C-alpha cells in the first residue's frame, strides 16, 4: 500500500502583484510541504512528478475561448493583467498564472494515472491555484481551470468512459464549476458540503442548495449539503458523512474518489468561519478510504490559514499512509434541518437512504 505525493514549487509563481498579502498566497503550498517534511510524512510517500496539462486535456472540460484568453495572459503587461482579472468574479492574474494552472492539473493527472494503474493506492496533491469555482467558459474565485473536474475526465480518458468517479468537495465554498460540468452526468457523482447561508455566501447562488439534484440522466448524482446559520464543526460534518456522504457513496460504488480538499472550513480560517479540526479532516479522509478499494486522490482547493491548512492536510496524508485515526456535542438544530432537507431531496434516487 503506497501513498503518492505531488508537489512543485513552480506553482508558487502565481501571485497578486498589487497585494502581496492576498489570502491565496504562494506560501500556502510551501508551508503545507514543509509540514509534511517536518512530520516525516513526505519521506513515507512515493514522489509523483508534476507536469503541465496540455491544451487538449484542458478541452476535456473547458471551451477553447476560455483556454485561449487565460493562455494569452502569459504575455500581458501588469495593467492589462489587472483589467482582465477584473472581468471575473474574484480573480487576480500574473504572467505565470497560466503555467501554474497547467501544473496544478497536470500534477493531478499524473496522480490519477498512478492510482488507476496501481503504482500507488492513493495520493495527495499539494497544488495551487485551486479549481472548483472554474467553469467551462469562465474563471472564478481564485480558480482558472477546474482541476478536479478535468481529473475526473482524464481518469475516464485513460480507463473507460463509464468509470465511476466520486468527487467529494469539503472546501467551505460550493464548487459551482464542478456541479455544472457534471450536472447532466451519471458517471461522476458530485457531493459538496458548503457554507450556504440561504444563498448569501460566496459564490452567492441558489445552485448550491440541496434541491439541485442534477439534470436528466444526471438526476440524483449531484448532492449539495448546504450549511445555514452559522458556525459548524466536526460534529456537523461527521453527521453529514454518516447520514449522507457515505451511504450514497457506497450505493454509487465509485472506482475512484477525488477530494476537492479545501481547508477553509478549518478552525482559524477567516474566509470560512467554521471549526473543523485537523482530527476532523483525518476522520473524513479515513471514511473515504473505505471506498473504491482505497483509490483516493486528495486535491488542495481553498484554505487560507497557513498553520491550519498545513496541519489539516498533513492529517489527511497521515491517514492515507495508514496511520490510526486520532481520537475526536449534539448537532446544531440548523445543521439537522440541512441534513433532513438533503435526505428528503435524495430519497427518490438513493434507496439506501
Ligand atoms: K464544498
Ligand atoms: K453529476
Ligand atoms: Na442514483
Ligand atoms: Zn473555499
Automatic annotation (TrEMBL):
GO terms for biological process: angiogenesis; chromatin organization; definitive hemopoiesis; hematopoietic progenitor cell differentiation; mitochondrion localization; negative regulation of cellular component organization; positive regulation of cellular component organization; regulation of microtubule-based process. GO terms for molecular function: actin binding; potassium ion binding; protein lysine deacetylase activity; transferase activity; tubulin deacetylase activity; zinc ion binding. It is found in: Cell projection, Axon; Cell projection, Dendrite; Cytoplasm, Cytoskeleton, Cilium basal body; Cytoplasm, Cytoskeleton, Microtubule organizing center, Centrosome. Zn(2+) binds at residues 171, 173, 264. It comes from the Eukaryota. GO terms for cellular component: axon; centrosome; dendrite; nucleus; perikaryon. Keywords: Actin-binding, Cell projection, Chromatin regulator, Cytoplasm, Cytoskeleton, Hydrolase, Metal-binding, Methylation, Nucleus, Phosphoprotein, Repeat, Repressor, Transcription, Transcription regulation, Transferase, Ubl conjugation, Ubl conjugation pathway, Zinc, Zinc-finger. The keyword Transcription regulation applies. The keyword Hydrolase applies. Belongs to the histone deacetylase family. HD type 2 subfamily. This is Protein deacetylase HDAC6. It comes from Danio rerio.
